[PDB]
Design a protein around this nucleic acid. Structure first.
Ligand SMILES: Nc1ncnc2c1ncn2[C@@H]1O[C@H](COP(=O)(O)OP(=O)(O)NP(=O)(O)O)[C@@H](O)[C@H]1O
Ligand SMILES: [Mg+2]
Length: 509
RNA sequence: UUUUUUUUUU
């Protein structure tokens, strides 16, 4: 269908809460709730999207704005207005369905909706319920029945679960569906779930199959995503509201980026330790940082190291998809509040999470996808604030850095080499309590991880994979020792006839 | 010797 570009204008008139009120777009009660938050003004994306989203023109909306610039209220504000506009119609029915790629981002959006509620008790009648995995199903359904929300916030899995059983009871009058982190929800693995979600909401709608308007929001999207959303976009028009220039890099400009290039992968562990050590001394422990790692198992290992080194200076929080949902929520609650600390996580916390006044984002390794470089570093430098990022990689991961220039126009200025001293190696490795069996599982998880992104990051399989596997030897402090495996295991990997496989593993069967 | 997420507490 037709895609109307609305690119960035640098001389247009500043839209405001006051102006939107007097103009007739915003009602007094929603103006009241947002004014009480005391924001200097509305953000560029907020100014650009609120009126169009509410416009009675029959169109979908795509919107791109940078990490930290308030996309959340860019959609929650217009949604509330629509609930006010139609307050007497279908008042016990879900009118807006917000979907997100992680549970913690679903729970964050709900939280923001609750913040709108607490700034105006009048808006509480427009109830909100979150349907996400890891929580009691029955209890959430009790909440749907008792509150009869007009807004649902969800992750795909649990939403499908609920839709297949209660789409008739709550979901026949949905008017808006929002895909936050849209580009991710349309990658393989979520796209089919979204298409099921969209298909059900469309079939079950009481007005028509094309009633629902669709809102796509992300810091990383182009026209390419309008093709992928094709099967879930009903309307004949689609506004593309852009606050970033066509060629301007998507990364937030205020973030001071740098990359530290080690000779081995494992060396990035020592680089990161020395860095955090230097920040704690220099900032007198006034340091809030997020450190990303490629896998659950390596993340867990990384926490052990950082605990041993830094627990006396700072709290170290472990955040990934194998942390139970109760703890995920509570530790997100803490790191939102805390002035200082290190959150160690996978890409579960790459997108959307809003942790105020993070000083630095650190990365050991590459992200799970190219776009996520941008989102990772976007956890810092939010709402006007400053921030730095350091990417810790090895020589063999440099093609990733090049691909950032080629595919995304991201040119990291600050680069430098790193080589660990024997003392840091001793300090870190002697504190490690993991058995060689545990160390194998961790390195093996890294081989798989790096194997997945070879084509995407243009890696040399013959160089990159032996370097990751040699991490096993470095951590046990015997560089020429190889990972003990069976022939049956080597055949699952499809490397029994590969020289690359001879370099990585030793058969100890 | 489940690479990041994502129902199965329906
Ligand atoms: N108009 C505003 N002025 C100043 N701060 C704001 C405004 N709107 C929202 N914020 C705050 O900005 C922070 C980030 O907002 P958020 O909606 O998470 O940005 P975002 O575009 O969704 N970032 P991401 O999803 O990570 O790309 C939140 O803590 C809000 O409280
Ligand atoms: Mg956001």
């Amino acid at each position: 269908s037709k895609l109307i570009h609305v690119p960035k204008e640098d001389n247009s008139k500043e839209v405001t809460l006051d102006s939107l009120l007097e103009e007739g777009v915003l009602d007094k009660e929603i103006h009241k709730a947002i004014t009480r938050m005391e924001f200097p003004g509305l953000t560029p994306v907020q100014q650009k999207t609120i009126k169009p989203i509410l416009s009675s023109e029959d169109h979908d909306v795509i919107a791109r704005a940078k990490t930290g610039t308030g996309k959340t209220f860019a959609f929650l504000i217009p949604i509330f207005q629509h609930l006010i506009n139609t307050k007497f119609d279908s008042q016990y029915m879900v009118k807006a369905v917000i979907v997100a790629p992680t549970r913690d981002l679903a729970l964050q959006i709900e939280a923001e909706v609750k913040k709108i509620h607490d700034m105006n008790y009048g808006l509480k009648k427009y109830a909100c319920v979150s349907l996400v995995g890891g929580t009691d199903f029955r209890a959430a359904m009790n909440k749907m029945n008792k509150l009869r929300p007009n807004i649902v916030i969800a992750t795909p899995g649990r939403l499908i679960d609920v839709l297949e059983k209660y789409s008739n009871k709550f979901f026949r009058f949905v008017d808006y569906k929002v895909l936050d982190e849209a580009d991710r929800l349309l990658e393989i693995g979520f796209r089919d779930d979204l298409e099921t979600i969209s298909g059900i909401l469309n079939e079950k709608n009481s007005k028509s199959a094309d009633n629902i308007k669709t809102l796509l929001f992300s810091a990383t999207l182009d026209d390419k995503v309008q093709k992928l959303a094709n099967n879930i976009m009903n309307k004949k028009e689609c506004l593309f509201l852009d606050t970033v220039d066509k060629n301007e890099p998507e990364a937030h400009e205020r973030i001071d980026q740098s990359v530290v290039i080690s000779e081995k992968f494992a060396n990035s562990i020592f680089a990161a330790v020395e860095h955090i050590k230097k920040q704690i001394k220099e900032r007198d422990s006034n340091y809030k940082a997020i450190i990303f790692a490629p896998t659950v198992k390596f993340t867990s290992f990384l926490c052990s190291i950082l605990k041993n080194e830094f627990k006396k200076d700072l709290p170290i929080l472990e955040f990934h998809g194998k942390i139970t949902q109760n703890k995920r929520t509570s530790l997100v609650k803490r790191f939102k509040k805390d002035e200082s600390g290190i959150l160690v996580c996978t890409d579960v916390g790459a997108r959307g999470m809003d942790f105020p006044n993070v000083h630095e984002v650190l990365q050991i390794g590459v992200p799970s996808e190219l776009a996520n470089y941008i989102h990772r570093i976007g956890r810092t430098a939010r709402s006007g604030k400053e921030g730095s990022s350091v990417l810790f990689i090895c020589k063999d991961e440099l093609p990733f850095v090049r691909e950032l220039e080629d595919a995304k126009n991201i040119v990291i200025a600050k680069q430098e080499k790193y080589e660990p001293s024997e003392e840091i190696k001793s300090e870190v490795l002697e504190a490690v309590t993991e058995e060689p069996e545990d160390i194998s599982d961790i390195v093996i998880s890294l081989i798989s991880s790096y194997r997945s992104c070879i084509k995407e990051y243009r890696f040399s399989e013959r160089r990159i994979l032996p370097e990751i596997a040699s991490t096993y030897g470095v951590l046990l402090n015997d560089p020429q020792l190889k990972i003990p495996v069976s022939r049956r295991f080597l055949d699952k990997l499809g490397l029994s006839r590969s020289p690359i496989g001879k370099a990585m593993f030793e058969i100890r069967d």
